[PDB]
């Protein structure tokens, strides 16, 4: 079984958002699902949940009043709608299986409360018996990117770092790989970075 | 509603002992507690449930005594490390509620390796400077950035980030000097310094 969600969203105070969490496999009904936060640095915090088959659900006394939480037993989905959005909703929203002990979490659906407006990245190439290269993701909103080498094929040597609010509010990351030096004049490296919130792409070749 | 320790640490091969106290009406009453394992940079996972019941190594137990539950791990790993969050239903506020979360490390000191890479070709004809600093495979987080200009210190323009966890268990940094074309080229070498532990480790490039 798996549990499945929706993409990460950036929504402004005072908006509405409803996330989804689809099932792959399993009596989704019969089971109950949770829905369950964490802000960046804080711990898990139950906001709520319902048993499909029944419809019936519950919330936590913090989120009620602007918490709903649904399902559906024919797509086997449920939904967890929150209305009048604040700062310090921003947060990671996990929906989680639990037969009516949570056994099956999912992905976590991150969603971005503020004012800013989405931007992809400019990814700039970082030139180099090892010799260490890399790829600067600049100036994105809002987390996360995700970078890979030669799409996958390289995982030795990786470090992909935490970004870094900048004072202009976006972003900057880094991601390096080290190699051996005198493969730099025969092998290719490419950094693939992908910023979903954007939905852009970029394969950059670092070039010495 | 439950309290567990903001931290425990043990070295490999240790016995470790997490607690997530409560009341009468949650831990106590017969209410089961709950004990799950998130990784850095991972959704939850169930370690243990009903009290001392398994889905997950041996190593993992769990024990309720009382108005307190206790989870042991014993012959500590690397991979253990993480934060450890206990689960109990309230009867009064209605509802199942995790602690505070305790997070779990596994512990001998280490020096940083440094990495400074100068602004992009691209970057500077793009009218933009970025300077990085990249600091890993450092024990304790603890870690120190500073920026200088010909030996001037630099202060403005510096965003650093604070020290996160690697995949082994040490952890890494990294810190952005931002300047403009005419900036990186007025000056015949910029460096950055990363102190840990009284010693540091300092890193220059020049146009």
């Known amino acids: 079984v798996q549990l499945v969600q929706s993409g990460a969203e950036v929504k402004k105070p005072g908006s509405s958002v409803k996330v989804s969490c689809k099932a792959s496999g399993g009596t989704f009904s019969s089971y109950a699902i949770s829905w369950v936060r964490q802000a960046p640095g804080q711990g898990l915090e139950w906001m709520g949940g319902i048993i499909p088959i029944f419809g019936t659900a519950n919330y936590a006394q913090k989120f009620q009043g602007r918490v709903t939480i649904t399902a559906d037993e024919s797509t086997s989905t449920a939904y967890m709608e929150l209305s009048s959005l604040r700062s310090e909703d921003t947060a990671v929203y996990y929906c989680?299986?639990?037969?009516?002990?949570?056994?099956?979490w999912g992905q976590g659906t991150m969603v971005t409360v503020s004012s800013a407006s989405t931007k992809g990245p400019s990814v700039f190439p970082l030139a180099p018996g090892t010799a260490a290269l890399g790829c600067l993701v600049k100036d994105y909103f809002p987390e996360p990117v995700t970078v890979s080498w030669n799409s996958g094929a390289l995982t030795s040597g990786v470090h992909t770092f935490p970004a870094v609010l900048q004072s202009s509010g976006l972003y900057s990351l880094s991601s390096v790989v080290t190699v051996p030096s005198s493969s730099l004049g025969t092998q290719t490296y490419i950094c693939n970075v992908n910023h979903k919130p954007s939905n852009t792409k970029v394969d950059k070749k670092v070039e010495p | 509603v439950l309290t567990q320790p903001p931290s425990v640490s043990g070295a490999p091969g240790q016995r470790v002992t997490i607690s997530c106290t409560g009341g009468?009406?949650?831990?106590?009453?017969?209410?089961?507690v709950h004990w799950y394992q998130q990784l850095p940079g991972a959704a939850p996972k169930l370690l243990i449930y009903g009290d001392t019941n398994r889905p997950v190594p041996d190593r993992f137990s769990g024990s309720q005594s009382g108005t307190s539950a206790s989870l042991a791990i014993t012959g500590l790993q690397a991979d253990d490390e993480a934060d450890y969050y206990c689960q109990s239903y309230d009867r009064s506020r209605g509802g199942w509620f995790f602690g505070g979360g305790t997070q779990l490390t596994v512990l001998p000191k280490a020096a940083p390796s440094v990495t400074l890479f100068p602004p992009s070709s691209e970057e500077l004809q793009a009218n933009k400077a970025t300077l990085v600093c990249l600091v890993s495979d450092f024990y304790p987080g603890a870690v120190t950035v500073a920026w200088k200009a010909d030996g001037s210190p630099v202060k403005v323009g510096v965003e650093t980030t604070k020290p996160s966890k690697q995949s082994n268990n040490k952890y890494a940094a990294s810190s952005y000097l931002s300047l403009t074309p005419e900036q990186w080229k007025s000056h015949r070498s910029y460096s950055c310094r990363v102190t840990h532990e009284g010693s540091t480790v300092e890193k220059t490039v020049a146009p």
């Open positions: 009468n009406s949650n831990i106590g009453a017969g209410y089961h």
């Open positions: 989680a299986r639990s037969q009516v002990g949570m056994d099956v």
